[PDB]
């Protein structure tokens, strides 16, 4: 007996550049009758077959969770480009597993805007697959420095989300869950 259907059933995720991650082992899950609650706007696969794992065992099963905007849905894919895929959370080219999301505008779009969830609009370079630069450094867009102040070409790196409910779907808050794996060379833990 193992409790998988937990975090998406939970209420408030982390902002996308602050993506919460769970390592799961010593477990056993239902990958189908939870999928067959297929009210997820988006679901498609890059590692293994869709829901044919229910008798398959793993070393590591991973589940990062965050909230993006609706347009920002497209990004959570091996080989993607943009302030979400480059600066916030990169999926590798060798990605093993899949992703689910659903419209949380119902839940996580506060009337003045969920000014809580945020993303890193700005990084010097681009983060590696599975990287989380939760840095507040006042990004130097311009040559003259910031020293820790906001100002011209000296901007706060993380832009807020401001999920007003009226938004186009592009900006309704989609609650996202990734399923990586590092099943190799350890006990048979997750089936």
């Amino acid at each position, epitope marked *: 007996l193992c409790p998988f259907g937990e975090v998406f059933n939970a209420t408030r995720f982390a902002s996308v550049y602050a993506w919460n991650r769970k390592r799961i082992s010593n477990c056993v899950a239902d990958y189908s009758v939870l999928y067959n609650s297929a009210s997820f706007s988006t679901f498609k696969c890059y590692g293994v077959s869709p829901t044919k794992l229910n008798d398959l065992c793993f070393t590591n099963v991973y589940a990062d969770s965050f909230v993006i905007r609706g347009d920002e849905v497209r990004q959570i894919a091996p080989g993607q480009t943009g302030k979400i895929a480059d600066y916030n959370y990169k999926l590798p080219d060798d990605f093993t597993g899949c992703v689910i999301a659903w419209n949380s505008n119902n839940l996580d779009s506060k009337v003045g*805007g969920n000014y809580n969830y945020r993303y890193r609009l700005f990084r010097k370079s681009n983060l590696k697959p599975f990287e989380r630069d939760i840095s507040t450094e006042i990004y130097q867009a*311009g040559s003259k420095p910031c020293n820790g102040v*906001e100002g011209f070409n000296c*901007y706060f790196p993380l832009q807020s989300y401001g999920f007003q409910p009226t938004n186009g779907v592009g900006y309704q808050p989609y609650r996202v869950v990734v399923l990586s794996f590092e099943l190799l060379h350890a006990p048979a833990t997750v089936c």
Partner: antibody
Framework: QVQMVESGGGLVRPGGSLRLSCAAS????????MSWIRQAPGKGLEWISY????????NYADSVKGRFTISRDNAKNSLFLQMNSLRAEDTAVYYC???????????????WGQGTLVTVSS | AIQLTQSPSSLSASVGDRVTITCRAS??????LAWYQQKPGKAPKVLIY???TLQSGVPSRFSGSGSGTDFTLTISSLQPEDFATYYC?????????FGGGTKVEITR
């Protein structure tokens, strides 16, 4: 056609609270670092606070720190002020300005709405 | 925390003279500076931004000058409507600051 509109001045008893409003259009509002300014009648003008493009970051000038409230609505092109525990010296004419455009990196000529009179007396 | 040396504080000019405003600065702000004219009570308006560039529709008589910390605003031939009070603004760090205010006159 760059436009900005202050509205929401008048009388307020000191220790009571007021709320300002800066409706905008003509530019793209959600791009700009917004900010307010006040001028004591005849006296020098004083920046009081700002707000990020995304509302992700703001800060008040010290003369009003905490007591007042920056806020912007990205989808109705409006900046706001909530003014509380007011004072007879908070009395000024309260401008708003459109300053910093992340859509570029170059200098934007800030746009000032026409202002609005707040006078705190009982 | 960048304070501005608005120089001078008051003046009066015969109609159509050249006048010049210094704005020295407590920091090195680079070219992060705008210049504003305030007809009595009205809102201010930009006249020079990027410390040198003219705003749209403005006449040419206003000349933007400066770099680093010393900044100059030139008027070519002063005009009877250019009666105003004037303010330069630092634009580098967000503590957002002005000059004390050059009140400016016409000698008719």
């Amino acid at each position: 056609q760059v436009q900005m509109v202050e509205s929401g001045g008048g009388l307020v008893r000191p220790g009571g609270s007021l709320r300002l409003s800066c409706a905008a259009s003509g530019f793209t509002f959600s791009d700009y670092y917004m900010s307010w300014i006040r001028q004591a009648p005849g006296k020098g003008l004083e920046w009081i606070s700002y707000i990020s493009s995304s509302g992700s970051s703001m800060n008040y000038a010290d003369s009003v720190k905490g007591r007042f409230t920056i806020s912007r609505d990205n989808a109705k092109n409006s900046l706001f002020l909530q003014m509380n525990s007011l004072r007879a010296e908070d009395t000024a004419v309260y401008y708003c300005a459109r300053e910093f455009d992340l859509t570029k990196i170059i200098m934007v000529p800030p746009y000032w709405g026409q202002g609005t009179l707040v006078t705190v007396s009982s | 925390a960048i304070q501005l040396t608005q120089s001078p504080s008051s003046l009066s000019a015969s109609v159509g003279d050249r006048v010049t405003i210094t704005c020295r600065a407590s920091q090195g702000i680079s070219s992060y500076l705008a210049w504003y004219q305030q007809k009595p009570g009205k809102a201010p308006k930009v006249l020079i931004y990027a410390a040198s560039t003219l705003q749209s529709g403005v006449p040419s008589r206003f000349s933007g000058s400066g770099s680093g910390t010393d900044f100059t605003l030139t008027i070519s031939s002063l005009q009877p409507e250019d009666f105003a009070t004037y303010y330069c603004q630092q634009l580098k760090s967000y503590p957002l600051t002005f000059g004390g205010g050059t009140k400016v006159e016409i000698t008719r």
